[PDB]
Design a protein around this nucleic acid. Sequence first.
RNA 1: ACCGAUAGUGAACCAGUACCGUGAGGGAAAGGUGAAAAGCACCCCGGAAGGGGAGUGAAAUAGAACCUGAAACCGUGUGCUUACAAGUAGUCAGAGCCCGUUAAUGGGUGAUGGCGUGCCUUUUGUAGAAUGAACCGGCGAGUUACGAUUUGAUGCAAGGUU
RNA 2: UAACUUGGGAGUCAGAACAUGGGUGAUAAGGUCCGUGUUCGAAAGGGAAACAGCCCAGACCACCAGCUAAGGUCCCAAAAU
RNA 3: GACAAUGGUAGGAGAGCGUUCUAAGGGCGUUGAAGCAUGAUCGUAAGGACAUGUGGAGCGCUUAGAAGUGAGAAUGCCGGUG
Lengths: 49, 145, 116, 43, 102, 112
Amino acid sequence: MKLHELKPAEGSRKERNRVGRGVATGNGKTSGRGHKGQKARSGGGVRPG
Amino acid sequence: MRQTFMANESNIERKWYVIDAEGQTLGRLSSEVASILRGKNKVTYTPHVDTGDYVIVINASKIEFTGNKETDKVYYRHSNHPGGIKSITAGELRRTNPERLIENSIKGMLPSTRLGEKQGKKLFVYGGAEHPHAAQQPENYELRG
Amino acid sequence: PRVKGGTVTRARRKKTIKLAKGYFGSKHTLYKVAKQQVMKSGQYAFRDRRQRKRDFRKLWITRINAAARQHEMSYSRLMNGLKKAGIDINRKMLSEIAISDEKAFAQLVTKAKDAL
Amino acid sequence: AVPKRRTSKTRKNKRRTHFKISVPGMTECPNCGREYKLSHRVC
Amino acid sequence: MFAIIETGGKQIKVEEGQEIFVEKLDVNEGDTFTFDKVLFVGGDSVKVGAPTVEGATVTATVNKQGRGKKITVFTYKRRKNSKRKKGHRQPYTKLTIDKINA
Amino acid sequence: MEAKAVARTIRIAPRKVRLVLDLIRGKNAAEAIAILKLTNKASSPVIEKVLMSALANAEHNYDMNTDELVVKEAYANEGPTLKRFRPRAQGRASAINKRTSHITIVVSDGKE
RNA sequence: ACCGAUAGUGAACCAGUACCGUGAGGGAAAGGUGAAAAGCACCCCGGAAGGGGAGUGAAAUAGAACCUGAAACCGUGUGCUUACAAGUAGUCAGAGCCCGUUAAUGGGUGAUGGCGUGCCUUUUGUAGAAUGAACCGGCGAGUUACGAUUUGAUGCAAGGUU
RNA sequence: UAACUUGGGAGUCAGAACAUGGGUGAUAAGGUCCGUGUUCGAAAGGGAAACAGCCCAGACCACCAGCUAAGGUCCCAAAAU
RNA sequence: GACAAUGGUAGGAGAGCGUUCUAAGGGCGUUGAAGCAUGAUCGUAAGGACAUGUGGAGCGCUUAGAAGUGAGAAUGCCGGUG
Ligand SMILES: [Mg+2]
Ligand SMILES: [Mg+2]
Ligand SMILES: [Mg+2]
Ligand SMILES: [Mg+2]
Ligand SMILES: [Mg+2]
Ligand SMILES: [Mg+2]
Ligand SMILES: [Mg+2]
Ligand SMILES: [Mg+2]
Ligand SMILES: [Mg+2]
Ligand SMILES: [Mg+2]
Ligand SMILES: [Mg+2]
Ligand SMILES: [Mg+2]
Ligand SMILES: [Mg+2]
Ligand SMILES: [Mg+2]
Ligand SMILES: [Mg+2]
Ligand SMILES: [Mg+2]
Ligand SMILES: [Mg+2]
Ligand SMILES: [Mn+2]
Ligand SMILES: [Mn+2]
Ligand SMILES: [Mn+2]
Ligand SMILES: [Mn+2]
Ligand SMILES: [Mn+2]
Ligand SMILES: [Mn+2]
Ligand SMILES: [Mn+2]
Ligand SMILES: [Mn+2]
Ligand SMILES: [Mn+2]
Ligand SMILES: [Mn+2]
Ligand SMILES: [Mn+2]
Ligand SMILES: [Mn+2]
Ligand SMILES: [Mn+2]
Ligand SMILES: [Mn+2]
Ligand SMILES: [Mn+2]
Ligand SMILES: [Mn+2]
Ligand SMILES: [Mn+2]
Ligand SMILES: [Mn+2]
Ligand SMILES: [Mn+2]
Ligand SMILES: [Mn+2]
Ligand SMILES: [Mn+2]
Ligand SMILES: [Mn+2]
Ligand SMILES: [Mn+2]
Ligand SMILES: [Mn+2]
Ligand SMILES: [Mn+2]
Ligand SMILES: [Mn+2]
Ligand SMILES: [Mn+2]
Ligand SMILES: [Mn+2]
Ligand SMILES: [Mn+2]
Ligand SMILES: [Mn+2]
Ligand SMILES: [Mn+2]
Ligand SMILES: [Mn+2]
Ligand SMILES: [Mn+2]
Ligand SMILES: [Mn+2]
Ligand SMILES: [Mn+2]
Ligand SMILES: [Mn+2]
Ligand SMILES: [Mn+2]
Ligand SMILES: [Mn+2]
Ligand SMILES: [Mn+2]
Ligand SMILES: [Mn+2]
Ligand SMILES: [Mn+2]
Ligand SMILES: [Mn+2]
Ligand SMILES: [Mn+2]
Ligand SMILES: [Mn+2]
Ligand SMILES: [Mn+2]
Ligand SMILES: [Mn+2]
Ligand SMILES: [Mn+2]
Ligand SMILES: [Mn+2]
Ligand SMILES: [Mn+2]
Ligand SMILES: [Mn+2]
Ligand SMILES: [Mn+2]
Ligand SMILES: [Mn+2]
Ligand SMILES: [Mn+2]
Ligand SMILES: [Mn+2]
Ligand SMILES: [Mn+2]
Ligand SMILES: [Mn+2]
Ligand SMILES: [Mn+2]
Ligand SMILES: [Mn+2]
Ligand SMILES: [Mn+2]
Ligand SMILES: [Mn+2]
Ligand SMILES: [Mn+2]
Ligand SMILES: [Mn+2]
Ligand SMILES: [Mn+2]
Ligand SMILES: [Mn+2]
Ligand SMILES: [Mn+2]
Ligand SMILES: [Mn+2]
Ligand SMILES: [Mn+2]
Ligand SMILES: [Mn+2]
C-alpha cells in the first residue's frame, strides 16, 4: 500500500452502531419501553423471582 | 396537469331562460333548475367558475305538492334568541310569498360555497305569470325529465 | 476532539424554512412550525396527486354526460353503446372532441346508438 | 384571567389601526410668521 | 384536422405541428418516431376507428428526451414514529408532430 | 442630493416616536416643522431638533434651497434598551424596559 | 489524532471578586478597533447627546458599546392581493395581473373549486378538553476501562502465545 | 412452499371492538371472565354524514389512461328522472 | 432481457449522508479563505455543487484512522427578544 491509499482487509471492521441518534436509525427510544429500560437496567445478574 | 379544457370569463356565455312552474312538483322543478344554474349542462362546464345560465321562474303560485305537504311539511327557522324557533309556516308559504318557497327550495340544492352562493343569485322567481326581465330577452325552456 | 455544532443545524433549518415560502404568518419563519407545516404539506401533496387523478376523470365524465344529454341520450347508454361498438377512446378525449368538434362527436354518437 | 394564546403579529397590528394621533388643527399667525392651534392665542 | 393516438399509458390529441410530451420512447433525439395506434381523426373528413383506424400513422420528430421536475415524496404517520422521503423525476420525450395521417 | 440626519439612542421608546413621525412623514418640510412644534408629545421637540439639523446639512453641504425641500422619509428604529426593574409584592421584582429610539430623517430636492 | 470564550479551571478580563447569608457557607457575569492611534484638525444643526460634510485608513457600510454580525423581534418602501365571509392555514385544480432564471415542459401573487381536526408523549384508543413547548440561538443523554461470550478478519497450526 | 436444529440479538407479559359458543350479571352494560374467527393496535385507500375495532381492499414511485369491489346512480354529488 | 417482491409500532438486520480532529497524497486562497446572505442548481434520502453580495485569512478534495459526530419537545440550563 502507498499509505495515502490504505485499505483495511475486506470483511474486517464494520462501523459501530450508535443508538439514540435520531429516528430513521431505527433506534430513538434506544431500546425497550417503560420497564427496566430504566438506566439502572437491573436484570439482577442471573435470576427470576 | 396537461391537455384538458378549462373555461375562462373571456370564454363563456350565460343565456336567460323562463320556466312555467304551473303544473310542476316542487322537488322536480327545483332540482332541474339547480342543474341549469350550476352550468352542468354545457359541456364547457368547469367547476371553479360559474358556467351557469340564468333562470326565471313563472306562475310560482301554481307549484304542486303531494301527501300532506301544505300542512304536514313544516318549514322551521330559528332566530338565535332563546326559544326563538319559528315553525310559523307550512307548505302554505305557497299561499304567502311562494317566490321564497321556491327560491329556498332550489337554493337548498346548490352547494354551500360562495360560488354556489353566487349561482343562487342567478335565480328569479315570481308568483305571477308576467315578469320584469323581458329586457334580457329570455328564451322559454321546457322542463325535461 | 470536541465537535462544535456550528453550521450544519442552521443550514438544515434554513432549507426547511425555505420550503415554507408560501406560508402565512409564523409558519414561514419559525423552524418548528414550518417543519410541521411542511410535513403535513407533503402528505397532502401525495394523497392529492392520487386524488387529482379521480377529480379529473369525474370532470370528463360529467362533460360527456352533458354532451350526450344534448343528443337526447343517457351517458350510461352512450358509453355502453361505444363499448359494444368497439370504440375505445378515453373520456378526456371525448370531452375534448365535444368541445373542439361538435360534428365529429355527434358522428361518434350516432355510431354509438347503433349496436343497440 | 390570562391570554390563552399569544396575540398574533397580524392580529396585534389590526388592533392598532385606531392608535394614530390627530394632525393638529393649525392656523397660521398673521405677519408674526409662526403657527398655532385654532382659536388659541397668537403668542 | 386533429387526431387521436394511443401512446403512453394513454391517449393524446394532436393538431399536427404541435409540441407534445409523452413517457419515454427509447428513441434517439432528433430521429422521427411514427405512432401506429391512431384512434380517430377530426376535421372536414372524419375517419373514426374501431380500436385503431386501419393504416394511418401520425409522424413526429423527436425533440428532447429529458426528465421532469423533481417532486419530493414525503409521507408520515402521526405520533407513531415514522416518515419517508424519496425524490422523484419522471423521464419524458418531447416531440413535435408533422403530417398526421402520413 | 437629498440630505439626511440622525439622532442615535434617544431616550424615548420607539412606539411613541413613531406616533409622531407618522404625522411628519412625507409632508413638505415647512409644514412639518409646524406640525412638529404643535403636537404635544416628547418626541415632538426631539424630532424637531433632528429635522432642523437635517435641513442644516441640506442647505450647507448640498447647496439646495431650503423652501422647496420635502421630508422624503423619517423613521425610528429599535436601539438598545436600558434594563431595570421594580420591586413588587411578596419579594418578587419584575422587569422594566426603558428602550431607545434611533431617529433618522431625510429631506429632498428632485431626482437630481 | 485535549478546550478554543455557554468550551477549557469557579476564575483567558484586578475571582473566591461583584453579589447573597448572622455565620459556616454559596458565588457570577464580563476576551477580540487597527498593520500602526494614524482615535475623525476643520465647518455645520444642537445645551449637550448625536449627526451631515471635510479628513486618517486597504477597509470606519473597521468610529470605540468598535472583526465577522445568523435567527427571533422592530421598522420604512411597496409588485400582486383583500371589506357577503365560518379559515390546524396547507395541498390539488386555476383565471387575472406583474416579472424574467444556475433556461426549465420558468418566477411572484392568487378570484374561484375539490380535499384536509398541528407535533411530541403516553396509550386498548388522543383533533383531544391527557402531557410537554412563548418564540429564536447556543448548550443538553449507551461512554470508557477491565473481564466474559459470540461473529467477522488476519498470522501460525498439533500447536498458538507471551 | 415451507419446516425443523443449533448459535448472536431482541421487544412483548395494560389490550380494544365486531361476529360467535359459553360462565358471572338481570338472556343489564361501550360489563366481566374463557373458546373460535376477523379487524384495530402497528393499515393509509373507498363505503357507513361524521365515526381505531363494521363492509370493500393491503399504499415501491410517477400519469389529466382503462376495468372493477363495498356502496351507489333527482340536486348538493360521479353515475338510471 | 423477461419474472416476482417492496404499508408498518416495539424491535432485528443492512447500506449510506454530514460534523470535528489526524496520516499520507494531491490541491485552492489578498487577482480574495472560512463564515454569512440571496438564487429558478444537482442526487432515491441524509445531503453536494455553482454564481453573485458580504467578509478580510484561512480552507477543501482523495484514501484510511479516531470521535466531546447530528436536537424540537426533558414544567431541561444560560442569553436574547416577544
Ligand atoms: Mg392541447
Ligand atoms: Mg319565548
Ligand atoms: Mg309576495
Ligand atoms: Mg405562490
Ligand atoms: Mg422534510
Ligand atoms: Mg427622558
Ligand atoms: Mg422570594
Ligand atoms: Mg440564613
Ligand atoms: Mg475470538
Ligand atoms: Mg406480570
Ligand atoms: Mg389477541
Ligand atoms: Mg356475557
Ligand atoms: Mg385479561
Ligand atoms: Mg336511485
Ligand atoms: Mg322511471
Ligand atoms: Mg463540507
Ligand atoms: Mg471553492
Ligand atoms: Mn451502521
Ligand atoms: Mn423501528
Ligand atoms: Mn407496560
Ligand atoms: Mn418513554
Ligand atoms: Mn421492557
Ligand atoms: Mn437501557
Ligand atoms: Mn441512575
Ligand atoms: Mn316558551
Ligand atoms: Mn359538497
Ligand atoms: Mn358552512
Ligand atoms: Mn477545535
Ligand atoms: Mn446543537
Ligand atoms: Mn335523456
Ligand atoms: Mn399600524
Ligand atoms: Mn419585603
Ligand atoms: Mn465567539
Ligand atoms: Mn453582606
Ligand atoms: Mn488589536
Ligand atoms: Mn452652536
Ligand atoms: Mn461631536
Ligand atoms: Mn483614503
Ligand atoms: Mn452589539
Ligand atoms: Mn481580524
Ligand atoms: Mn461589527
Ligand atoms: Mn437580519
Ligand atoms: Mn411588508
Ligand atoms: Mn368582496
Ligand atoms: Mn345573503
Ligand atoms: Mn362546520
Ligand atoms: Mn397548481
Ligand atoms: Mn404563474
Ligand atoms: Mn372542507
Ligand atoms: Mn422524538
Ligand atoms: Mn381547545
Ligand atoms: Mn402524566
Ligand atoms: Mn425547550
Ligand atoms: Mn404549556
Ligand atoms: Mn422562560
Ligand atoms: Mn473501542
Ligand atoms: Mn476464525
Ligand atoms: Mn436466538
Ligand atoms: Mn402471565
Ligand atoms: Mn394481562
Ligand atoms: Mn357471549
Ligand atoms: Mn325482564
Ligand atoms: Mn356483553
Ligand atoms: Mn370491555
Ligand atoms: Mn376493562
Ligand atoms: Mn376473543
Ligand atoms: Mn401500543
Ligand atoms: Mn383503515
Ligand atoms: Mn395484519
Ligand atoms: Mn375510512
Ligand atoms: Mn353512523
Ligand atoms: Mn368519508
Ligand atoms: Mn387510523
Ligand atoms: Mn365501468
Ligand atoms: Mn354491485
Ligand atoms: Mn350527477
Ligand atoms: Mn417496508
Ligand atoms: Mn404493498
Ligand atoms: Mn441494528
Ligand atoms: Mn473548521
Ligand atoms: Mn444554498
Ligand atoms: Mn478547494
Ligand atoms: Mn453531543
Ligand atoms: Mn430551544
Ligand atoms: Mn431565559
